[model samples]
Target: AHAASYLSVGYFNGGGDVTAGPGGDINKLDVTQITHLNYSFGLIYNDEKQETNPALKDPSRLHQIYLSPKVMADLQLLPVLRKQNPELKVLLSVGGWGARGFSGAAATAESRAVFIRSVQQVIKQYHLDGIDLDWEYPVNGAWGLVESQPADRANFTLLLAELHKALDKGKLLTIAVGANVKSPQEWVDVKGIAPYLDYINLMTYDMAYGTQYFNSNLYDSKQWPTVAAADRYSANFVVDNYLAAGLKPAQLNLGIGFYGRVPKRATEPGIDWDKADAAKNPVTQPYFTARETAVFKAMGLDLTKDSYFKYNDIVSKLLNDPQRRFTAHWDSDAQVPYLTMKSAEGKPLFAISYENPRSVALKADYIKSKGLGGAMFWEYGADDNNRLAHQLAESLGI
Candidate 1:
């Protein structure tokens, strides 16, 4: 179970404040119940940004770096957590989404050796036990990526193999995989990467919301027979996918999101269902207060709760006197929402909920029932504190 928890750590920038002890050590990490932990390795290009798009300039503002005093503070926090729960395991995740190119730099035998040496130094510097490669969909469609022929896939395998050779068995060597059903094209030759890895973490969330599509739907919806496979994201979905791609179930892990999405509404009038333009994607779904969903109901329809309606009102000149930008509607048949434009209006912003308990429950049940390795959450920060994580833990009997 500890092996499966896959908790994330990083420069607590946009997420929360990092409170440290007298010596800049994480003093009070009010971690309720984390079976495992992951340090989101903050290297050069992958430094955490305050916001997503227009990336921050100074790296120090990021709160944590591999070699910063703040990172030292973070490293000190690991042993502190270990002291609190000796059974817990910590794995460093190297290279996250949008940060690549190092694959090319590290692909060279010489470069990889240098990087491996640097990793060993860092491991000793922080006394970490293992490393997890978090190259966001490596070898394909990733920024700063290293292009490789079919052999590079094997070369990627060689890189991990080299790390496995150097790092002792006590240390870990794992890689994260994209949630896509197509295993091969997504950058990993599963057959090649399997032997070198302790396990492969499959990120299976972010379907309708993640892609730039104006579709509102539950990411793990029971509908969508194409995605669900057997019966609504069964254990077999993960197990079969991995084994089918030539990986063992024991060496496979499922990734679950601690959030939900609320799709954008059609317009101020609020149609029940409507098809939105594909180009009108990247919807700005207002975050609904889960702590007060009841209060939202009590007040009939709070603008905050009904994000789509609120967006519709603003665009339709009903609330903010703004010209009709877009309208939205929810489709119960698909269990999703959409944003539609009147004419050739600008691309409408579709609303998508990124946090909820229902999504977490559905995925958690599927993971536990499958009896695979474990579940890895993208992060703990996104949820309402630890409410969603705690709920999943309770479901898992943790």
Candidate 2:
């Protein structure tokens, strides 16, 4: 007796265009396309005196959640968006990359109590429907992160257990999990913590080893010997790993990234995946569409400044290659596409890996076959005219 409907969750950037609407403001949002929107982030308050990171290192505060003035203001507008889409559920997402205090707060029972109280305070104040802990990792991170919180694996669960108990019915508790494919336990106790969550949002994007590699592939079979043998990275393998380990497919939410990856530079015959050397040349960062990048150039902004770009940056202006500098090709095996730039001498210029409508349709099919909970994107702000959003919504009937 299951409803046929699927959830379409958008991890909306709280640094909104100063309005309560979906991506930028009410004028830009088609609320009907979304089922859940997470207010980008709600900071993890330092409850103990162990904070070493400077921004949240306050010792006297004991326990306090933080949202930038912009993010906080953006949150206020969500209630109005909810009125337009009565089925929408807005959540306060706490802890993003390097946003500390989780370890110190979850380290002790007392600290956890205060942390939970702080979250509740934010929930009551903001009218959020739940909490999404996007902590980059539990016992893993950069620059002595795990060194400071050696017991995080166990503590993370304890913290969640308490938070789970504190929330009443109708409130959701979920965690956005990143994985290593080989050892996902390093990121989360996939089996142990399953009991406390409404969904386990797996970040299945950004797996590219180079521009030639697939960024958010549905299958791991590109015939690339190394990637295939290692089972290094692919959305399918990641899901298989989790399901084999201890996760129920229904409690899992797969990810869809609305961005693309590019190398710092490229050469002639640049974009061919088979000819590309992932080791010698790695995918440096993300970049958006052709039109947007063109705008950036006209505005006197350096195109290299950002590592992230939107769907429009890829499909909108870039795909057509207005200057005819490159050719785009689709890999039926990988179920995605890439672009390669050509030099006048027929040498390598550069290449990029990006996702589009056709691939997302296949992803939707995979989710259905796997009996997954739903799909989620990184941030709604990256979407271009909600192009990919409508594609996924229509394909999945979300």
Candidate 3:
């Protein structure tokens, strides 16, 4: 389950990690002598199960594809490495977003057979080694899948058992699973499926933002808008959650995000990046992320820097109606920093930031310190030039 001395360099963008041809970019990474390489591109279709099942209807789901000429460059790089180090392996992932009855589809003996055959066809078709099941979850309940009755749980195991049997030991079969403490309870049958996988990559970094109020749980908490003690942030919480759920430390892989999510409020007077703590502020129900950085920049704000945390005070002061307190709260327990202000009638709102390189390292360090499998991030191009990934490898000695 644990990786060898060298860390695997994975680009979430596939060949698109760099706009350049596959040529020496990957070879340059090869020179680093990293022991493993994992990259992901999207399946053209059918990865989402929201519509096919009643139990799987998450309105917030977003599906992406990874089939550009740039993706082709990524596809071409794998064989070169395999030819050089036959021990190297690559996999094509299927079933991401919401695990939604993807397993239900595969759980049937006939359906499982069909799914496995299709996978085998794709593997041979691409001349790749194996497949990765990125189902948001299986068995129990998933965001886009049917609920897991006791029967579904049992069938989930049965489905994996069939795939494991169909896949030779020389090939790989990895599972990208939920990174939170709730996985075993709300999602997968980890205890039952671990035996069948080559690795279980935990998608851990989404602790804040769209969820509840908590301290910023990223590596660089110092850079957060409403700053707090650094101890508040730790990826170990997610790792601990997995262990509590019965996953072995070695079998688990960690995930890091290259970008950051920012949760800000319309402050009476916008906050100065360096003096965020000095300002009195109120919270907005919704938060923003680096993906919207360019939008802010276009609005004539300097929120696009690597460490810039901006707050709009003008909007806050202008909208400071009689009932608002104008202060955001950063909770330490959740490891996510957000706004905590009330509405006129009294409702609470939370804001949070996404993870960037400075933030991603927190999980990377936790992954390395805990002696877990390895780190998994969202994508490559998200960083300047694998900047965050490089930082992770350096910090973890990967």
Candidate 4:
């Protein structure tokens, strides 16, 4: 029923960074490897009903990129991405963490119509394969975003219904949902929403954080016995949750965290790795720092200040800085890899839990064993030399 061996999906966060990174912009993605590439964060316009705009900006590339004048230029890369795999689907994912407008759009038919028209225009304007709705949470606001209503649960389904009608039959319809949907009380009407989606991308990462937690893992770690057995954050937990809710495994895409989180506290002695001062030191900056400024300036985030790093940044630090001792540890029970490293002050900084080839391989195996659809990572720019991507493909025998 599907064209690719499996959907190997990735997200691209657009901004000035797309062109400035060492990865050479979103245009340089190895299309041959990814089956679906989602353009991250196209903003919603509940106020003026404007077309979806790129979440961030780069004045330098404004004249040359899409999400602006010639803004659909990224779509030009789709043909190249399709060359290696004709089935590749390039989608525009709308909304993101803390984003607003969905509440207004879905609350009334007039607004829904306005939003749907804009989406249709995007599909027509750039020939996008489909739209990936990511409204954070329907009834509940997520991450400091305060726009929600009990009616949002039903309204979200209605919005999707309209979108389903707006899209051509050949076009795909999908959504990214929270992985922690443990009850009917959650934002999504799982039963109502599942029927409308071609694929449900479960955000299995970020399943745990605060107090030295793993960003993602294949199985539950034994160290934290206090957590409910079912409450453990793991790939299996998300899959099982959806499956139990009557969602078909084939429609579920497991999330793979391409980045790692550094807790404020390190199990070993290290530095604070403060956010305000990271850029002053090359060792603390992300390997991909082009979009770093926009992140803090607009989104109010600092990866290094938080100690989060992409695989490339991790590798760069381990290889380039000898003063920073990096030790890799495997949690066999959790089925994830963590790196223990010190801060500038020679004290324990934080435990960096992340994914690697082996952990991803296990997840790929689980996907195959469960007859799940495929894998989707948060962003494509996080990897190095496509190591994790290649691992998933190899495990899938693609």
Go through the candidates in order and give the C-alpha RMSD of each one to the true structure: 10.4, 5.6, 11.1, 8.5
- The C-alpha stretches of model 1 lying farther than 4 A from their native spots are 1-32, 44-69, 143-151, 182-186, 209-240, 260-350
Model 4 regions more than 4 Å off: 1-5, 16-24, 47-71, 182-185, 224-231, 264-307, 342-350
Estimate every model's Cα lDDT from 0 to 1.
0.49, 0.68, 0.51, 0.67
Worst 10 residues of 4 by lDDT: 56-65
How high is the lDDT of residue 213 in model 1?
30
Candidate 3 off by > 4 Å: 1-6, 9-11, 14-35, 42-74, 80-88, 98-101, 139-152, 211-234, 263-362
Is 3 or 4 the stronger prediction by lDDT?
4
Residue 110, candidate 1: Cα error in Å is 0.8
Two-way TM-score contest, 3 vs 4, winner? 4
* Candidate 3 lDDT over residue span 52-108, tens digit each: 532224332222222445546667667677777675556776655533436445546
lDDT of model 4, residue 95? 72
Q: Give the TM-score of candidate 3.
A: 0.62
TM-score, model 1 to reference? 0.62
Error of model 1, residue 267, in angstroms: 12
* Number of the candidate with higher lDDT, 1 or 3: 3
TM-score of each: 0.62, 0.82, 0.62, 0.78
Off by over 4 Å in 2: 1-3, 16-27, 47-55, 142-148, 210-212, 221-231, 263-306, 347-350
Q: Per-residue lDDT of 1-398 in model 4, one digit per residue for the tens? A: 66446677887665322211322267556666778878765655443233233432333322111253323566666667677779678888877665556776788887788778878888887788998987777777664364677788889999898889889988888888886753333778878878788898888876544332567877777753212232346778777877877788888899898777654322212122343453343222122223323332232335434445676666675424455466777888888887655544554333467888999898888888888899888677777878888888788776
